[PDB]
């Protein structure tokens, strides 16, 4: 009833935070590379 409430709508946002958290993780993505100026560093 009201005892069932505590972690529930807590998870209605914490997992959403976690979804945004794991979301961003890769969004900026002899032979080592392909361009000569990229070799310069």
């Amino acid at each position: 009833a009201m005892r069932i409430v505590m972690g529930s709508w807590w998870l209605f946002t914490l997992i959403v935070c976690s979804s945004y958290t794991a979301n961003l993780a890769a969004f900026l993505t002899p032979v080592r590379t392909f361009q000569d100026l990229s070799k310069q560093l």
């Binding site: 505590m6 807590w10 914490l14």
Partner: peptide, 29 residues
């Protein structure tokens, strides 16, 4: 990569132990 990340993780334990003592005292009476 995790500074205010685990803040809410402890906040849920706060409201947990809060209502854990609260309804227990309301119902053991």
């Amino acid at each position: 990569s995790f500074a205010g990340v685990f803040c809410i993780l402890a906040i849920g334990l706060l409201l947990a132990c809060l209502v854990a003592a609260l309804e227990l005292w309301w119902n053991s009476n």
